[PDB]
Amino acid sequence: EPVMTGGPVQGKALWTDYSGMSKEVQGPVSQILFTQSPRTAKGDPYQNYPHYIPEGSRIVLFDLNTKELKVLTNDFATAFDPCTYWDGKKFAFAGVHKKGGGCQIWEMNIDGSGLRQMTDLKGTCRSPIYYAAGSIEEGEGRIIWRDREGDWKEHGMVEKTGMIIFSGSPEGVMDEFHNPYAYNLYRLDTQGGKIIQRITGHVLSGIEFPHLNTTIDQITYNLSSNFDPWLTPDGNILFSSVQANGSRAGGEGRVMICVDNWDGAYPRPIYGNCDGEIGGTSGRSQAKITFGDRKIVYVESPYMNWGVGQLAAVSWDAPFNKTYEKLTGKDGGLYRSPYPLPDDRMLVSYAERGDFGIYWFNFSKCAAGDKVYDDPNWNDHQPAPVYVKYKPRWINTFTAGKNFGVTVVTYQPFDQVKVEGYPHSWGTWICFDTTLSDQPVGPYPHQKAKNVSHGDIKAVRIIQGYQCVEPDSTRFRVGAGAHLLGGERSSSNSGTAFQQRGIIGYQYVESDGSTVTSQLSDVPYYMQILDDKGMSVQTALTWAYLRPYHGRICSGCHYGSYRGRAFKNIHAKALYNWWYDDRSHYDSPFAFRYLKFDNDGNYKGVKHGEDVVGTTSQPVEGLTLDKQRTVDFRRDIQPILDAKCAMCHDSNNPPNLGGGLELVSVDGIAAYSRAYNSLLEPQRGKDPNIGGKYVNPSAAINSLLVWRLYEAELSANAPREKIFPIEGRLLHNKFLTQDERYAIVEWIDLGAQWDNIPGPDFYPGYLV
Amino acid sequence: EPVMTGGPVQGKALWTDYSGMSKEVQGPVSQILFTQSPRTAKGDPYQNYPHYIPEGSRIVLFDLNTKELKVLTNDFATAFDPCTYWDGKKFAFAGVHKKGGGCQIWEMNIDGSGLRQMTDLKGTCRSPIYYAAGSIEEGEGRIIWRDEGDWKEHGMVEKTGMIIFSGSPEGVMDEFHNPYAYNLYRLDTQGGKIIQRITGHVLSGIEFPHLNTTIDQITYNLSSNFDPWLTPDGNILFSSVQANGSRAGGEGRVMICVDNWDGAYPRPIYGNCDGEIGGTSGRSQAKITFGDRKIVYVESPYMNWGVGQLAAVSWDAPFNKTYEKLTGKDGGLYRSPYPLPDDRMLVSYAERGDFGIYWFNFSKCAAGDKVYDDPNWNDHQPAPVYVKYKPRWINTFTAGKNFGVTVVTYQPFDQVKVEGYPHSWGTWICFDTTLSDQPVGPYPHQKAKNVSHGDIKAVRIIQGYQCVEPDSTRFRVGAGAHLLGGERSSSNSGTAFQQRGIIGYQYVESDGSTVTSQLSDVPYYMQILDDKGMSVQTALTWAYLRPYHGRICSGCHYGSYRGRAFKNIHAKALYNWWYDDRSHYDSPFAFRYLKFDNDGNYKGVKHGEDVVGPSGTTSQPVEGLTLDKQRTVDFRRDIQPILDAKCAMCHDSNNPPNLGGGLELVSVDGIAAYSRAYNSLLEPQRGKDPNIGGKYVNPSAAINSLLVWRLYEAELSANAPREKIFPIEGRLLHNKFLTQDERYAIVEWIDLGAQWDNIPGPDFYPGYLV
Ligand code: HEC
Ligand code: HEC
Ligand code: HEC
Ligand code: HEC
Ligand SMILES: [Ca+2]
Ligand SMILES: [Ca+2]
Ligand SMILES: [Ca+2]
Ligand SMILES: [Ca+2]
Ligand SMILES: [Cl-]
Ligand SMILES: [Cl-]
Ligand SMILES: [Zn+2]
Ligand SMILES: [Zn+2]
């Protein structure tokens, strides 16, 4: 049947219509695959989602007719997350074998034979899916490349099995909630790099598994978990992303439904991350799309880390509030792992009182319909019916994986590091108007601290987030700053919800508000727009990432060009600063290490660092990771306070800046110094996520401390009712030089941390 | 051991310390009572909480040593909510007899004998508890009263106690349009003779002669009040649903609060205010620990759920700083916690979904060793047997319905049947109406502008009408889903505000103090008004006065009833309250109308037609006690004709808003409820929270409404409805189109919540019909 578009004949669908062709190619459903889990907190740890390793679980095949059940995973200690192939004769899953090796990705035929290990990783792997890239039809494709200046010739063939997109986490890392996992999406070459060689002309760059004949490449760099990938009708990857960055979303964060390319070139939000939307802090997981009405249907859990909950839906074509539905939707139990069929039916895992089973869903009654299978001794979930899957279109990839770009002219793969000689992979990004936003003027860091027009935004600060890695368990403590702004998300490293960060660099902004820059690739980052004093007016709280050689465009600053609105037609100066030279990949300037000011401390220009190192016409700066600058309170700030402040500020004259770097014990926890505790102290009647008495994290322009150091009213948000005292006033603007003052500014805009150097270091801190 | 205070001997507690005495008076526990429910949506309907009737459930007794189990309730088809007596030889519960009668309150001995029926109520009853009032030590007690007069003993009554339970009538809808509205009832077990012992007159209320019991309604909330329990100082701890109008993001909140056993002084404890933890989470089954004095309650993910995690806040200082999460790291579901004087606790727990009884572990922040878990039953509501210490009983100044008790001679009196008043009445006073912890903001529970003393001229007093729609062809839920109300709208209104009317207006003194006499035993709230007669701030909640009672507050949500001590204030209203010895109260009754000057500014207050056996027990004219004659603003009867006369001529489809078409219903998404003008005026605006307002209308703030802004042709508040308000080109002055009465009729309509059908039940005025 036609769905998205009309077909060749009445009642028939065009091959371009994914939904319709899926309807026509489905066929009768007889057998289904699903996961049976032990009923235990350890057997069904859905409270630890996305990190879900239902130890003791198995994958089973059930016949809807003969009612006979077969266990396919008997050789596995744990097995889960089944996903069938296109033909339905084989399927991929996640699990750990009895022989050991950890939780990995495997695939096996539907009859139970032909087992193969797709991943050997240090970490845990989950939820594999098949993405057919360069394989639409069954057979062998041909590999062709250029002679390096010769012609294009054929070399060899490859069986077309496509790729595998999965979610996985490394070993010994912490997310922004300090959970001991960080998940991200990986693309996997099933043929050992030769699929990517067929598509590109070079084998996949990434981590190679020659013993398994596979290769993996990390396509998503988010500092928190990205999980449960699926397929969009237009051939992209649909998944759930945790946006936890700093104090955003009331210091809670949100789990959003979003999509990205299979190489991770174009991540964009679908629903759930933006203010005014529905579900709040609810967890959103296991999202899939209906074929008939094209509905994104997902599990909405009451807790952000829960994998069980209700079922909700939003239109795929129009993911807005107007199309939001709560499917189930009341009485009285729990739902999980929904699976929409092309014939418009649906399979859900339902627990009426407390124990899950496979059930047909009923849309008329808004609840679970007739029963498929339930064992009382098992929790039955993740139904995966056996049928024929129509392959979504595969999108062209301009990256060969790690360090590897593919030119737009000759389409020839190139290594930016090993060959071209760059210290690190580097992409570019461009914003056509930095002043253009849908956000109002407000106290919160993601909003505007003041009205800004074209010319008011002088530059932008680009910041890289650092993963939280703490091998030594004696030198790190979570909740050390609970008395400070951070609360439960604070730690030995920071008294705020902001984890460790560093400055990628500064880039100037044109008089029309446009900006473009070259910077590091495959690293989590975000930006801040700056006024003529070099303070952040507005912060983008999220983790952006660039694949090698990839540019990224946006109309505005959270304007809707990547969310709900069409791109605005804009003729921008930055466009001509991007690529003008024949001999270059990109001619855009790299992020500068410093800024330079005038006498007053107003913005003058950008200043090169000493990190400067023929495929680009501009000085290459800021690609060396070991040289990347940050602002540490102990190394940078505290000495300034000891020199020019502590003398005049003691217990009698608050805030108390004295005592040097000596740690102070609060609630039996010694983490920070006196000055840090004083400056990070909360204020009555003020949201800690906004800031404290003297400090607003990731807004310096809103901070009382900065207000006093400049002795001016900097923003439209007053820190308190009485800022400057009437009598006894003393002007603080002459106490510091521009270097020290702007060092404090940078410290606050970075999130006002304590330890900005990842891992245990020599500088003072928590010890037990 | 001593807890709150010190004892006479080291290691022992004073008799004034409740939590201290309870540790000694408890005794060993060899047996427990608990409820077993079938595992089904209809067998354990916790999703419909508080309205919970676990059909097919039994109450059982279990010995912790001999491991024996016995079914006491076998005569009942449905039985639940166990509560043990003080000695532990008997208990009370909610049950459905196999012979019928509905779900009522019952009590029986621990052995299974002595079955007695407490409630015949037409409706549902559950969660009964014992409150010992005039009963501390076992025995009989005296009944004394006065006839020139003396105080004579008229004989005795068994001292047993009172029963506080939750109950709801039938054919009734709450603010969420659920088919139940619960409240709290006090019950005399001796047939009114215990109330006669305390007050000197039998309890007035609904009488149950054949059961020898009497009931009185102590809580008038339009939404459900449930799960009553005991405070260490002798009050009633329970859960309250505050849903009123668009309150709290339009979804309302479920708060833990306390009230006197006669319902004289309800006050919030935790969960109802901005900044507090838990949001829209349900808070139910709240109990208090003896050792560290912690309120421990079930925090449900969903507002209507009776299962969830376990949360706690200190009873002594119920604030965010004492808040903590007791559970949740195992992913299991908890319900029905029961703290012990031994600093132990019994919890109902389903790890992977079979609910059972478990000993709680505080060191693990989760459930401990198993007590009894049957795979075939949800095992919950554990109620261990032991001797319970009795909380203090507070003096009641009301004998129940229509009955007050004099503060001078302490003599019960009937305000209606005897004194000749149309309805029972009471008083309330605020010392400063301009005093608040709330900032200036767009939301109706905040200030629309800064107000000082003298800026607040008067106050509007509004009575909430319960939603009763027996005929299903005349009423539809979600008729206004395209409007501001959303799914909480109905055939009655396009907003979340249900039907209500005007109790009346009362002037405010120059210092911000106000006091008034008004109806009692009815739900109501107040609005402070500026010199144009518009609400600056609305109190969104449901307040109720017992007969002859009166209630004081320092300020307007200043925190005198929440987290702050009363501010010392010498108020002008204090001298307008009771100055005469021959009167109960000398304070003025709520006036029906207003008087304005030629400028439209507040001149004063005006008497209505309802003025009234009657006796000389008050100095002021009696106004607004007739429920029949209580005035409200209805859009069809009042506003629409004004719109047709003065408006619709220039407003058609080509000139928004479209006010034409008369009262003819407009079908929207297959539902025809309201007219064209109503649909137009209640239309939402892009980028604006509908909980605040729409294009032309902000419910329960007229001063924030663009329509009113234009009708007065001025900027009324500090919250602008939109960026472009007054056109610079082709503008037309709208201020002289209406008289003062019409314009202020619109103002009143908007301040009331901008309803459509304000007349409860099906009427002759145009509306939804199938
Ligand atoms: C080193 C550059 C610093 C910093 C960072 C601060 N001070 Fe001072 N200070 C002094 C006096 C007499 C006052 C009170 C009078 C007035 O505020 O004008 C202050 C006040 C502050 C504040 C404001 C605190 C508040 O209002 O709550 C802040 C944030 C602050 N200081 C920071 C005196 C001196 C002084 C001479 C004795 C010197 C040197 C400093 N201060 C240095 C610093
Ligand atoms: C013809 C003399 C009119 C009468 C009778 C009424 N209105 Fe009117 N209205 C009229 C015009 C020409 C305009 C254009 C805009 C302007 O401000 O002049 C309006 C506008 C309004 C508006 C503002 C709509 C908006 O800005 O979105 C409102 C709220 C409005 N009119 C309401 C209104 C009411 C309540 C009337 C009866 C008292 C009424 N109008 C009569 C012309 C005429
Ligand atoms: C001004 C700062 C910018 C600029 C220059 C860019 N973005 Fe966007 N961004 C911005 C804000 C205020 C937010 C939301 C912060 C919060 O706490 O909610 C975001 C967020 C994103 C996201 C997350 C999804 C979403 O919120 O819509 C993505 C994805 C994203 N930003 C991408 C993006 C792109 C492609 C840009 C072009 C270079 C870009 N940002 C620039 C503000 C700003
Ligand atoms: C100005 C209007 C008043 C006055 C004259 C009184 N109160 Fe209070 N009240 C008020 C607001 C704005 C709110 C919160 C509304 C909301 O959250 O949407 C309340 C709330 C209450 C409550 C509910 C519990 C709580 O919020 O603390 C109770 C109970 C209560 N108010 C009682 C009360 C009493 C005893 C008063 C003395 C006459 C009183 N109110 C006056 C604002 C106002
Ligand atoms: Ca099952
Ligand atoms: Ca460190
Ligand atoms: Ca059980
Ligand atoms: Ca009616
Ligand atoms: Cl944008
Ligand atoms: Cl108050
Ligand atoms: Zn957003
Ligand atoms: Zn409140």
Coordinates of C-alpha atoms in Angstrom, one line a residue, chain B residues 247-248 251-255 270-273 275-283 297 299-301 303 323 325:
Chain B
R247 CA -2.7 25.4 40.0
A248 CA 0.8 24.0 39.9
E251 CA -1.7 19.4 37.2
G252 CA -1.9 20.3 40.9
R253 CA -0.1 18.5 43.7
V254 CA -0.7 15.8 46.4
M255 CA 0.6 17.2 49.8
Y270 CA 5.2 19.1 53.0
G271 CA 4.9 18.9 49.2
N272 CA 2.4 21.7 48.2
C273 CA 4.7 24.6 47.6
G275 CA 10.7 24.7 45.5
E276 CA 9.8 21.6 47.4
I277 CA 10.9 18.1 46.2
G278 CA 8.7 15.5 44.4
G279 CA 6.7 17.6 41.9
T280 CA 3.6 15.8 40.7
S281 CA 4.5 12.6 42.5
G282 CA 1.7 11.1 44.6
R283 CA 2.3 11.1 48.4
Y297 CA 5.5 8.1 53.1
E299 CA 6.1 8.5 46.9
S300 CA 4.4 7.3 43.7
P301 CA 5.8 8.1 40.2
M303 CA -0.2 11.1 41.1
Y323 CA 14.3 15.3 52.8
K325 CA 15.2 8.9 49.5

